[PDB]
């Protein structure tokens, strides 16, 4: 089922051969179900962390009103 085929045990009937030939394809099919999602999520998490580090680095990159505003600040130095 895993397409190793050591060769230590091989069928020698005319029915065993049929069922082994079916078995190999069935293994190729069954095992090829996770390897899509697993590699997809590996890529997914790695690119997520990549954009995470670059986002943090981009973060590490980073009058008639002042009269009225500083008037308060003056008005606070009433304390001494």
């Amino acid at each position: 089922m895993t397409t190793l085929g050591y060769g230590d045990m091989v069928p020698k009937t005319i029915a065993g051969k049929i069922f082994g030939s079916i078995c190999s394809l069935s293994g190729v099919l069954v095992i090829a179900l996770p390897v899509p999602v697993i590699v997809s999520n590996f890529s997914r998490i790695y690119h997520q962390n990549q954009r995470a580090d670059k986002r943090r680095a981009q973060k590490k990159a980073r009058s008639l009103i002042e009269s009225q505003h500083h008037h308060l600040l003056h008005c606070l130095e009433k304390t001494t």
């Binding site: 009225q68 505003h69 308060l72 008005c75 606070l76 130095e77 304390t79 001494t80």
Partner: protein, 179 residues
Amino acid sequence: GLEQLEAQTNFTKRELQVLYRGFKNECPSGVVNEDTFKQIYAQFFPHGDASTYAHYLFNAFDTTQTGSVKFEDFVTALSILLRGTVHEKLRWTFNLYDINKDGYINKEEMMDIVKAIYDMMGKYTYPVLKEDTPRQHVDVFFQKMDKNKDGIVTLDEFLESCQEDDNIMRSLQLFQNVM
């Protein structure tokens, strides 16, 4: 309602629109909570701490005992503090000073407010810094504010000394024309 509120506060109609817009534009009228005061005030006082003082007039503005009151009860106190009567402004500030909400200010109690302002002053005092001097600045209060000479002050016992200090009756009336 804009009209039910115009006939309570001293503002006009236009000056109620012009600040409902400003209020709602930054907090889309959930209602302001402390976490909004402690930063709306703080953007006016850099080089200093504004949180611990804001945490007293937040309790003052809030007539009810919710954790966030309203807009109507916000402008209802803005109108008083700016264009209200001196005998009403003084009552409002008094309710701010009465930290135990009961009707009595203790020397250390209002010390809790002065240690907040002086905290808002900055990291380093411009002249020499003295930690016992917030201890006189409070007691020099009572020197006028106590016609009993006991060390405890109530609303009449707070006002009956605060109506002749001409300088504040001219600085309790600073902004009542600017707009």
